[PDB]
Amino acid sequence: SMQAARLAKALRELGQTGWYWGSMTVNEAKEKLKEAPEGTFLIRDSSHSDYLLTISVKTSAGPTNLRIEYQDGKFRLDSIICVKSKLKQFDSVVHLIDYYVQMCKDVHLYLTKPLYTSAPSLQHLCRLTINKCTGAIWGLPLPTRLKDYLEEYKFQV
Amino acid sequence: MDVFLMIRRHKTTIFTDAKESSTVFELKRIVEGILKRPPDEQRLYKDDQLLDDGKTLGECGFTSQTARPQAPATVGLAFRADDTFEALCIEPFSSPPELPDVMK
Amino acid sequence: MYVKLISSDGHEFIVKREHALTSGTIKAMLNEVNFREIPSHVLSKVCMYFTYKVRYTNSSTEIPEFPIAPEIALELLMAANFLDC
Ligand SMILES: C=CCc1cc(CNC(=O)[C@H](Cc2ccc(OP(=O)(O)O)cc2)NC(=O)Cc2ccc(F)cc2)ccc1F
Numbered sequence: 648s649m650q651a652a653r654l655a656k657a658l659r660e661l662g663q664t665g666w667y668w669g670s671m672t673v674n675e676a677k678e679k680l681k682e683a684p685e686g687t688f689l690i691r692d693s694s695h696s697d698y699l700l701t702i703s704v705k706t707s708a709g710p711t712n713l714r715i716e717y718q719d720g721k722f723r724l725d726s727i728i729c730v731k732s733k734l735k736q737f738d739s740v741v742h743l744i745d746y747y748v749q750m751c752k753d754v755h756l757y758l759t760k761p762l763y764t765s766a767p768s769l770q771h772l773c774r775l776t777i778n779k780c781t782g783a784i785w786g787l788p789l790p791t792r793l794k795d796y797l798e799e800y801k802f803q804v
Numbered sequence: 805m806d807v808f809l810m811i812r813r814h815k816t817t818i819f820t821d822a823k824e825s826s827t828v829f830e831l832k833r834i835v836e837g838i839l840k841r842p843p844d845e846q847r848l849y850k851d852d853q854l855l856d857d858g859k860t861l862g863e864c865g866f867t868s869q870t871a872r873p874q875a876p877a878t879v880g881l882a883f884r885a886d887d888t889f890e891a892l893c894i895e896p897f898s899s900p901p902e903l904p905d906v907m908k
Numbered sequence: 909m910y911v912k913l914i915s916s917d918g919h920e921f922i923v924k925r926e927h928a929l930t931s932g933t934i935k936a937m938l939n940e941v942n943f944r945e946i947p948s949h950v951l952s953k954v955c956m957y958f959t960y961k962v963r964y965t966n967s968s969t970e971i972p973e974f975p976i977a978p979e980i981a982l983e984l985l986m987a988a989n990f991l992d993c
Contacts, residue, residue, distance in 0.1 A: 683970075763971040766964040769957045769993050773985035776976040780907035787904065789982060793989060808959055810952075818910075818922045819955050838910055838922055873959035874974045897948040898917045900979035907978055 650720030653738060657722065660741045661700075663771065663800050666690065666761035673712055676703035679762060680710040686751070686759030690715075690744065698725070700740060704758055711754060715740060724756075745802040761804055770796070779803045807861055807871035811835060811848075812894045813881040821873075824862030828855040835881065847889050849880035912940045913955065919948035927958040932992035946990075950983045954991065961993070 661667045668676070671691035680687055680703055688704040698714040699722075705711075714725040721736035722743050723729075737743040748758045767775075774797055777787070784797045805825070811818040811834075820834055832843035848855040855864050871877035882892045911928050913921045929935045931954075943951060957974065964971045976984060 760973075765966075766961050766971055766974075769954065769961075769974075769988035769991075770985060772957075772974050772976060773981050773988055776978060776981040777907070777985065780978045780981070781904075783906050786906065787982065789986070793985060796989070808963075815919045816922065817919065817952065817955075819924070819927070819959060821959070872972065873963040874956055874972060876956060876959065895919075897919065897952050898915075900949055900977070900983070903979050904982075 648720065649717075653720050654717065657717075657739050657741070660739055660800055660802075661690065663767075664690070664741055664761065664804075665763045665765055665767040665771070666804075668764050671703075673701075673703070676701075676712070677710040679703075680705045683762060684759065686757050687762055688744075688758045688760075689762045689764075690740070702744070702758075704756075706754070706757070713756065715743065741800070741802050741804075745804050748804050771800070774800055775803065805862075805868045807866045807868055808873045808876040809866070809871060809879050810876045811879045811881050813883065814893060815895050816881075819876065822861060824866065824868060825860050827857065828859050828861070828864065829857040831861070831879065832857070841883055845884035847882045847892070849882070849892055850877075851880075852892070855879075911938070913951060914940065914942045915946055915948040915951040916944055917947050919951065921951055921955050923955050923958060927955075927962050930958045930961045930993050933990060943987075946987045947983070949980055950987050953980060953984055954987055954993075957988075957993065 666689050668689050668691040673694065676689065676691060683705045685705055685707055688702055690700050690702055693699060693701040693714050695714065699717040700715040702713040702715065703710055715722055716725060722740045723734045723736045726734060747756055751758055777797060778801055782801065784794050787794065805823055806821050807824055808821045811820060818838055822831060828848055829843055831848060832846045835846055836842055850864055866877050880892045880894055882890050909925060910922050911925045913923060913928065934941060960974055
């Protein structure tokens, strides 16, 4: 099963990032990232039908690209170049990105900050700031409907 | 070349923008249209430095790079009181409550 | 041209009307608005958000980071939700 209900939730989260560039081509991503700081990244659609999404990221040697596959309800990095045995699988593609961003805080994958396609809502910027401080949404002095809002996007990027 | 500002007197904060090339006097004209006091009844400040009407905001040290829309630079404003100017007085914003322990 | 947004502790923020229309809640309201539950350390940041949102929508400029201190983030979230921005 492709688990389309899970896929739709994942693509909704992706729509909330403000750093998903949709049908952007590899050349357009290169031009956007050519002068960005090392680790600057975005996600966009892949030209390749075996892949759902592509990470474009500035390396020291110039922009590079890394595909993401979605199989059996799981996202993971391209298993043709990654050792499929050492590949973590995710229910969420924003979670996938956030995991690798945070692991970098601790060709190699090095991700720092996203290139935004548009300025997010102030509510979302607050959500990001809160998520960078804690994951314990359940105990924050917020009304329930704002806790539900935070729960819809738990990520730090 | 845009500079983004907070013009502050007492408990009043004007959010506005201008160019590095515009003058202190032209800022006072913006203030005049909002607060209805003429330029010669205004003094403008960067920190404790009184600003000369004839100088550009860039000449006073307000730069695009450091007066951004998400972090505007503050210009202090004092008005005429009787035969003199009031002392510059900008009243602070309220202070945030203590952070919940889990986000410290 | 300008509107006046007043915090709970009595600070007056005079902002471009077009920028304040960033908030659906202010926009539905509309020249003076009193926010009985938003204190000035929150509302000042809201106003900076308006300037930032207008400047960086439909622009060709790289979008910079919007700084939010952790100590205001919970109140700022509540205000932004109330303001629909
Ligand atoms: C754990 C993982 C390790 C990892 C491995 C890699 C390997 N990466 C590639 O060998 C990709 C292959 C690709 C190319 C295009 C593409 O875009 P699309 O999906 O749209 O076809 C998707 C993938 N080579 C390029 O990027 C070269 C390039 C650059 C700029 C440009 F203008 C055109 C091409 C990258 C980072 C890593 F951390």
